Design a protein around this ligand. Structure first.
Ligand SMILES: *[C@@H]1O[C@H](CO)[C@@H](O[C@@H]2O[C@H](CO)[C@@H](O)[C@H](O)[C@H]2NC(C)=O)[C@H](O)[C@H]1NC(C)=O
Ligand SMILES: *[C@@H]1O[C@H](CO)[C@@H](O[C@@H]2O[C@H](CO)[C@@H](O)[C@H](O)[C@H]2NC(C)=O)[C@H](O)[C@H]1NC(C)=O
Ligand SMILES: *[C@@H]1O[C@H](CO)[C@@H](O[C@@H]2O[C@H](CO)[C@@H](O)[C@H](O)[C@H]2NC(C)=O)[C@H](O)[C@H]1NC(C)=O
Ligand SMILES: *[C@@H]1O[C@H](CO)[C@@H](O)[C@H](O)[C@H]1NC(C)=O
Ligand SMILES: OC[C@H]1NNC[C@@H](O)[C@H]1O
Ligand SMILES: [Ca+2]
Length: 641
C-alpha cells in the first residue's frame, strides 16, 4: 500500500558500485580494431559519466595464456624471466575507461596461469611466493607503465582458493608498497570462503570483500556474520535482448534487497567476440563487427543507467528498501548531502530469466505505490523522473518532474509490468546519443593479412581470435621476405581454466562460411617433431574448443601430412607423405566446396577430391600440433556464405 522511505533510524549498507567484466575470455577481442569515431563512441556509451551505462567499476582478466571462455588472453610472463606489459587489450581498455571516468574502480582477476608457474604441475599453489610474485608484478606494471592504480585483486576465478596463498599475497602486496590494494575472495560460491573467515582471524584480517558468482540474489548466514562487504562479483551472462535487460534490472535491485550485496558486476562488458562462440551476445551491448563499424546499444545499457547515472560508490542504501506488494521491488539511496535516488523495478518472470539460476514462477500485476518521505527526506519537494518500458519498447525517456508541494512528503505511481522508474533529486541525467553507426555486414568474403606492421598498436593481428595458444606479431630482422610474421609463442600448456585443446588454434572470419579457400605461408620451428595446419569449417571454439570439427590440413616436419575432420585429429579424411621439413617456409592452400576438399603445397596439388562431411560450416583457422613455436605469413581467405 504505502511505503515509508526514512533515514531517521539510520542507514543501510554503503553502496559500492555497478560494473562489468572484460575478460574470461577474450570478450573485448573484436573491439580494438573498430575504426574511429565508432570505437570511441562505444567506449563513451560504456564509461562516459552521465551518458550511457556510466559504469562505476571495470573488472578485467589477468591473462594467463589459457582458454578462458571465448578465447585465450596473453600473459605478461609467457616464460620465466619474461616481462612485458603491453600485450593484449586490457591495459588499453582500463586506460580508456579511466580517461572518461577518473574515479572508475579497477579490479584484476586470474582465470588461467602460465604453465611455468606450476613447476611441473597444472597447479598454481605449488609455490605460493612465485604465484603471488607473478600477480603482484601485474599490479606494479599497471602503475609503472600505464599509470593505473588497481583497486582490487582476486584469487582464482571459480576455482579453489588456498588460505596460505591469500595470506602470502597480502604480505607480498604490502612488501611492494601496495598496502592500498584490497583483496576479494574467492570469486566462486559463498562457501568455503565465508566459514573460513569465521574460523580464522588471520584470514579474516586480509580479506576485504567476499565476492560470490551467480548467487541468485541471495547470500548465506556466515557471509552476513563476517561483517565484510558482500558483492555479486560476477552475474548476468544473458543475451542482451529485452529478456537479459529484465534480468539485469531485477538483480541490480534485488541483490541488495535479498542478499545484502552492495555491488553487482556483469559478465560481460561488451560482446566483442564472434557470436557463435560460447554465450554469444552476452554483454551489456554488442560490438562484434569492426570491419563494418556496426554496433548495437542494447537495452542493458539503459537499464544500467537507471542506477549508475544516479548513484555513486560511497552513497548509502536506506534501511527502507523492499519488495512491492504485487511484484517487483524498490531501493533508495542518499549521499548525505541532501540528494535521494529511488529505483523501482517490476520485471515479470517470463521477461527476466537469467541463465543462472532459473527462478520459479512469480507473479507481477498492476499496482499503485504510495511513497512517503520521512526523516531528513521530507524536506524534498522536487524529483526528476526517468522511465523505461521493456518490450515496442521505450528506453531511458525522461518524464515530467514530480512535485511534492503538499508538504505531505508523499506521492503515488501507477505501475505496470516490465517497467523501471528512477526518481532522483539529481539533475545531471542524460540519454547520451550518437548518430546511428553503419549497417551490419558479414565478414568480408575476400580477406588478407601480410602482417607487415613494424610498430603495431596491439600485440596481435586483428580478427584472429586465439582459442588455444597465443599468436603474436613477430619481427625477424634476419629475414627479408618474412620479416614481419604471425607467431605462436607458447612452448608449454598453461595452468588451464578450461579444457584447452592439445593443439593451438586461432579462428577468423564468418561462422556461416561453408565453401572456402584458405591460404597461408607456414614455418615449423621444431625439428622432426613439429607440425602446423590450416583449416576451414571450424564449428566450435571457446570453452568447447576441444570439440571443434571441420577440415584440418596438417603438415609435419617428419615429411608427412594429414587431413582430419577434428582438431583432435582422431578422424581421418586423408594422409600421406610430403616434402616437408623444419625451418623452411611452405605455402599451404586448402579448398573446400560441398562434399569435397583439396590441398596444395607450394601451388602444387598434394591431395584432391577428398570427401568431407557436408553440409557443414564454420570459421577459417591456423595453428600448431602442440604448444610449439611456429610462424605464419601472408594469410588469405576467399569464401562463400
Ligand atoms: C541483510 O538484509 C536483511 C534483509 O534482507 C536484513 O535482515 C532483516 O530484514 C527484515 C526484513 O526482511 C527486517 O525487518 C530486519 O530489520 C532486518 N534485520 C535487521 C537486523 O535489521 C539484515 O539486517 C541485513 N544484514 C546486515 C545489514 O548485516
Ligand atoms: C547533490 O549532489 C550534488 C553533486 O554532488 C551536490 O552539488 C555539489 O555540492 C558540493 C558541496 O556540497 C560542491 O562542492 C559541488 O561543486 C557541487 N556540485 C554540483 C555539480 O552542484 C549537491 O549539493 C547535492 N545536494 C543537493 C540537494 O542537490
Ligand atoms: C557450396 O558449394 C556447393 C557445391 O557446389 C553448392 O551446392 C550445390 O549447389 C548447386 C546450385 O545451387 C546445386 O545444383 C548442387 O546440387 C549443389 N550441390 C550439393 C552437393 O548440394 C552450395 O550451394 C554452395 N554454397 C554456397 C553458399 O556457395
Ligand atoms: C497473477 O495475479 C493476478 C492478480 O491476483 C491473478 O488474477 C492471476 O491469476 C495471477 N497469475 C498467476 C499465474 O497466478
Ligand atoms: O556464464 C559463463 C561465465 N561464467 N563465469 C566465468 C566466465 O568466464 C564465463 O564463463
Ligand atoms: Ca609478412
Amino acid at each position: 500500500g504505502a511505503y515509508v522511505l526514512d533515514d531517521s533510524d539510520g542507514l543501510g549498507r554503503e553502496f559500492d558500485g555497478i560494473g562489468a567484466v572484460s575478460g574470461g575470455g577474450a570478450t573485448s577481442r573484436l573491439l580494438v580494431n573498430y575504426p574511429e569515431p565508432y570505437r570511441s563512441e562505444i567506449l563513451d556509451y560504456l564509461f562516459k559519466p552521465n551518458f550511457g551505462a556510466s559504469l562505476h567499476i571495470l573488472k578485467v582478466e589477468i591473462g594467463g595464456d589459457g582458454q578462458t571462455t571465448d578465447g585465450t588472453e596473453p600473459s605478461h610472463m609467457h616464460y620465466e624471466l619474461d616481462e612485458n606489459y603491453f600485450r593484449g587489450y586490457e591495459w588499453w581498455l582500463m586506460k580508456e575507461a579511466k580517461k572518461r571516468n577518473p574515479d572508475i574502480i579497477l579490479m584484476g582477476l586470474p582465470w588461467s596461469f602460465p604453465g611455468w608457474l606450476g613447476k611441473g604441475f597444472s597447479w598454481p599453489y605449488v609455490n605460493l611466493q612465485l604465484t603471488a610474485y607473478y600477480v603482484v608484478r601485474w599490479i606494479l606494471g599497471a602503475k609503472h607503465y600505464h599509470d593505473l592504480d588497481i583497486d582490487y585483486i582476486g584469487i582464482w576465478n571459480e576455482r579453489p582458493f588456498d588460505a596460505n596463498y591469500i595470506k602470502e599475497l597480502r604480505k607480498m602486496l604490502d612488501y611492494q608498497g601496495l598496502q592500498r590494494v584490497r583483496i576479494i575472495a574467492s570469486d566462486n560460491l559463498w562457501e568455503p570462503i565465508s566459514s573460513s573467515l569465521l574460523l580464522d582471524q588471520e584470514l579474516w584480517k586480509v580479506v576485504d570483500v567476499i565476492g560470490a558468482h551467480y548467487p541468485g540474489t541471495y547470500t548465506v548466514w556466515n557471509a552476513k556474520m563476517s561483517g565484510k562487504k558482500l558483492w555479486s562479483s560476477e552475474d548476468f551472462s544473458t543475451i542482451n535482448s529485452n529478456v537479459g535487460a529484465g534480468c539485469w534490472s531485477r538483480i541490480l535491485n534485488q541483490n541488495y534487497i535479498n542478499g545484502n550485496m552492495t555491488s553487482t558486476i556483469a559478465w560481460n562488458l561488451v560482446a566483442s567476440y564472434y557470436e557463435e562462440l560460447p554465450y554469444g551476445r552476452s554483454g551489456l551491448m554488442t560490438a562484434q563487427e569492426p570491419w563494418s563499424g556496426h554496433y548495437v546499444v542494447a537495452s542493458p545499457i539503459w537499464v544500467s543507467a537507471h542506477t549508475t547515472q544516479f548513484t555513486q560508490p560511497g552513497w548509502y542504501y536506506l534501511k527502507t528498501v523492499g519488495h512491492l506488494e504485487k511484484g517487483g521491488s524498490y531501493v533508495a539511496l542518499t549521499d548525505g548531502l541532501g540528494n535521494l535516488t529511488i529505483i523501482i523495478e517490476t520485471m515479470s518472470h517470463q521477461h527476466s530469466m537469467c541463465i543462472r539460476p532459473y527462478l520459479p514462477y512469480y507473479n507481477v500485476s498492476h499496482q499503485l505505490a504510495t511513497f512517503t518521505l520521512k526523516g531528513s527526506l521530507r524536506e524534498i519537494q522536487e524529483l526528476q523522473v526517468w522511465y523505461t518500458k521493456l518490450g515496442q519498447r521505450l528506453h531511458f525517456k525522461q518524464l515530467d518532474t514530480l512535485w511534492l508541494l503538499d508538504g505531505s512528503g508523499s506521492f503515488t505511481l501507477e505501475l505496470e509490468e516490465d517497467e523501471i522508474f528512477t526518481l532522483t533529486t539529481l539533475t545531471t541525467g542524460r540519454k547520451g546519443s550518437y548518430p546511428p553507426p553503419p549497417s551490419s555486414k558479414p565478414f568480408p568474403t575476400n580477406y588478407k593479412d601480410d602482417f607487415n606492421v613494424e610498430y603495431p598498436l596491439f600485440s596481435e593481428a586483428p580478427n584472429f581470435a586465439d582459442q588455444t595458444g597465443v599468436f603474436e606479431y613477430y619481427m625477424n630482422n634476419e629475414d627479408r621476405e618474412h620479416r614481419f610474421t604471425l607467431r605462436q609463442v607458447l612452448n608449454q600448456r598453461p595452468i588451464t581454466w578450461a579444457a584447452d585443446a592439445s593443439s593451438t588454434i586461432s579462428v577468423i572470419g564468418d561462422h556461416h562460411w561453408t565453401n572456402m579457400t584458405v591460404q597461408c605461408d607456414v614455418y615449423i620451428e621444431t625439428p622432426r617433431s613439429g607440425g602446423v595446419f590450416i583449416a576451414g569449417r571450424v564449428n566450435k571454439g571457446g570453452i568447447l574448443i576441444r570439440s571443434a570439427t571441420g577440415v584440418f590440413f596438417w603438415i609435419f616436419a617428419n615429411g608427412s601430412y594429414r587431413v582430419t575432420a577434428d582438431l583432435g585429429g582422431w578422424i581421418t579424411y586423408a594422409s600421406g607423405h610430403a616434402d616437408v621439413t623444419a625451418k623452411r617456409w611452405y605455402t599451404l592452400t586448402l579448398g573446400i566446396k560441398g562434399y569435397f576438399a583439396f590441398g596444395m603445397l607450394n601451388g602444387t596439388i598434394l591431395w584432391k577430391n577428398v570427401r568431407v562431411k557436408y553440409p557443414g560450416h564454420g570459421w577459417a583457422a591456423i595453428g600448431t600440433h602442440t604448444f610449439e613455436f611456429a610462424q605464419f605469413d601472408n594469410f588469405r581467405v576467399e569464401a562463400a556464405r
